[PDB]
Design a protein around this ligand. Structure first.
Ligand SMILES: NCc1ccc(C(F)(F)F)cc1
Ligand SMILES: NCc1ccc(C(F)(F)F)cc1
Length: 330
């Protein structure tokens, strides 16, 4: 079987993407953030503290004839940006774009951090990293992808994120009309639970390509591109007036500047990120300083190929027994 769902940016900056997901019987439709950097499916629910809910659609297990409380199970998660949430665990039927999994662990948030409360358009997260990162205790739970793997025509899903436009998550098949040229596959390390791979280098604008290994993770749940300080400094040096601001927490640049493109290597192939993708707009309403989409990973400890990079490509997450990542131009 297969599944296919449209994913839509939540705002005009492509800060995140939401995808409708059907949970329960009868279906309750929630808009979830598909996150290949985490492995928990958690939702705002009727059990969430009422003051921590501001416009979200909530999952109500008591109205689902297929929901079962997973006795004694709890979950607690903290994301790399400081966000967190926690609660209890149900099992229920979950469907994405026609692809149905029964007995999926649905983690019901009793408490959420402020950053989720303020994001009225995101009803929860759907983790798509490896199940070793799932936070359910005492019994670890499998991701939606892991549960679906057996019935999928092919153990893959693909991410086709749009620039200021809707995109597609496909499960179980590779749409050969969605990209140009060939798909270049590269090896994945699962030792930390992430879709971790090694990029073969980079180029700034029309400059020479610098062959150098950059280890990082493919993370649809992170907005920006986080790279080593040496790379990020070489990019922003080509933007007149750009500077790293400690008060802002990263590189900013004059909104009137034109940004050079950024190329990253996948094996022998090259993925070009247009300079317009790196502009994340004024740091405050009316400001003439704009926030950059390429930032240093030094404070983070891991390099992150977030949405800025991934939306420049058609990306195959190959969940075969030896997993690989595929990249194609589009
Ligand atoms: N998108 C989920 C996520 C969030 C943070 C991290 C970090 F910061 F730990 F690398 C990885 C993955
Ligand atoms: N990387 C996971 C993640 C995704 C979204 C959010 C936000 F924006 F909703 F706070 C935080 C953390």
């Amino acid at each position: 079987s297969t599944g296919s769902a449209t994913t839509t940016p939540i705002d005009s900056l492509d800060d995140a993407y939401i995808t409708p997901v059907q949970i329960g019987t009868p279906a309750q439709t929630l808009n979830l953030d598909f996150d290949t950097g985490s492995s928990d499916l958690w939702v705002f629910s009727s059990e969430t503290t009422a003051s921590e809910v501001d416009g979200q659609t909530i999952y109500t297990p008591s109205k689902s004839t297929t929901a079962k409380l997973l006795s004694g199970a709890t979950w607690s998660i903290s994301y790399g940006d400081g966000s967190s949430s926690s609660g209890d665990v149900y099992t229920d039927t979950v469907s994405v774009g026609g692809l149905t999994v029964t007995g999926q662990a649905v983690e019901s948030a009793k408490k959420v951090s402020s950053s989720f409360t303020e994001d009225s358009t995101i009803d929860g997260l759907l983790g798509l990293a490896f199940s070793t990162l799932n936070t359910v205790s005492p019994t670890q739970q499998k991701t939606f992808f892991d549960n679906a793997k057996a019935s999928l025509d092919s153990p893959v899903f693909t991410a086709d994120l749009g620039y200021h436009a809707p995109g597609t998550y496909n499960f179980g098949f590779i749409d050969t009309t969605a990209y140009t040229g060939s798909i270049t596959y590269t090896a994945v390390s699962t030792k930390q639970g992430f879709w971790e791979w090694t990029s073969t280098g980079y180029a700034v604008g029309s400059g020479t390509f610098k062959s150098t290994s950059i280890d990082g993770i493919a993370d649809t749940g992170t907005t920006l591109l986080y790279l080593p300080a040496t790379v990020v400094s070489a990019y922003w040096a080509q933007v007149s007036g750009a500077k790293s601001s400690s008060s802002v927490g990263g590189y900013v640049f004059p909104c009137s500047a034109t940004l050079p493109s950024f190329t990253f290597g996948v094996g022998s192939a090259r993925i070009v990120i247009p300079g317009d993708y790196i502009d994340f707009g004024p740091i405050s309403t009316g400001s003439s300083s704009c926030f950059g989409g390429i930032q240093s990973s030094a404070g983070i400890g891991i390099n992150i190929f977030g949405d800025v990079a991934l939306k420049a490509a058609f990306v195959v997450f190959n969940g075969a027994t030896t997993p690989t990542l595929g990249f194609a131009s589009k």
